[PDB]
Ligand binder design. Structure first.
Ligand SMILES: CSc1nc(Cl)c(C=O)c(NCc2ccc(S(N)(=O)=O)cc2)n1
Ligand SMILES: [Zn+2]
Length: 258
């Protein structure tokens, strides 16, 4: 009886195995755009993905992860609210059963169809496992998806999904360029938070881009053909793998713009 997003093991249940679920800096959160304060001390974000090396794509039973070689300084996130350098390790998405839901963060209570998470760890801690034990261990870059025109840069991901339908399946996924998933503007909101899945560790500087990317109905429909279950098990469509907004508590969301 492991955690999930099903009828009986979903977000409302996680606190039983992971008490930090009711903690002081949990994610995601609603971004109230009128209350987020412009912070002129914030820097432009620096996203350096030219040398990114993707290796593999994995269905882990909760989402799919596109995994990167992080054995040297290649693909890094710095600047913005960050001190030091954060290395890209994987990206994944959260999405809905319908276009009207799927994102984890919301914007003035608006839910997007999906949300992309580019996950980076602070190189000062040497590896990911050590980084997640620190309040400034991770930086996750969050990007909203809306349904409209196709994202050509996403299609290579969409097309490989049929080969990793069920939990535990993986496929070679080399030479994928995540620059193709970025919007035009890097304007962002930022706040201190947590992993949005168990173990829900309070180790993330969240950086959420204001500009969503557009993907097509057909592209997101293919996300929805994935399975939570393993091969040869009754089919459970991989949909609604998002955690709802959590109490903001004693935190301020800062804006990089205007
Ligand atoms: C705790 S040990 C560990 N080690 C590795 Cl090697 C990974 C690999 O990713 C990992 N991932 C957990 C994770 C959960 C949730 C999020 S989210 N939905 O907040 O962006 C990012 C990362 N956790
Ligand atoms: Zn995520």
């Amino acid at each position: 009886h492991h955690w999930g997003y099903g009828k009986h093991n979903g977000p409302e249940h996680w606190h039983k195995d992971f008490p930090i679920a009711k903690g002081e800096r949990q994610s995601p959160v609603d971004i109230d755009t009128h209350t987020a304060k412009y912070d002129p001390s914030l820097k432009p974000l620096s996203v350096s993905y030219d040398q990114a090396t993707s290796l593999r794509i994995l269905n882990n039973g909760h989402a799919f992860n596109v995994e990167f070689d992080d054995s040297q300084d290649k693909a890094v996130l710095k600047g913005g609210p960050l001190d030091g350098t954060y290395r890209l390790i994987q990206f994944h998405f959260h999405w809905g059963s319908l276009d009207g839901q799927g994102s984890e963060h919301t914007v003035d209570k608006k839910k997007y169809a999906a949300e992309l998470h580019l996950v980076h760890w602070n190189t000062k801690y040497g590896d990911f496992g050590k980084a997640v034990q620190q309040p400034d261990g991770l930086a996750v870059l969050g990007i909203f998806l809306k349904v409209g025109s196709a994202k050509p840069g996403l299609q290579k991901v969409v097309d490989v999904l049929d080969s990793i339908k069920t939990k535990g399946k993986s496929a070679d996924f080399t030479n994928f360029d995540p620059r193709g998933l970025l919007p035009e503007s890097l304007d962002y909101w930022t706040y201190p938070g947590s992993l949005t899945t168990p173990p829900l560790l309070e180790c993330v500087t969240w950086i959420v881009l204001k500009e969503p990317i557009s993907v097509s109905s057909e592209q997101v429909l293919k996300f929805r053909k994935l399975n939570f279950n393993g091969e040869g098990e009754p089919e459970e469509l991989m949909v609604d793998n998002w955690r709802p907004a959590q109490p903001l508590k004693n935190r301020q969301i800062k804006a990089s713009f205007k």
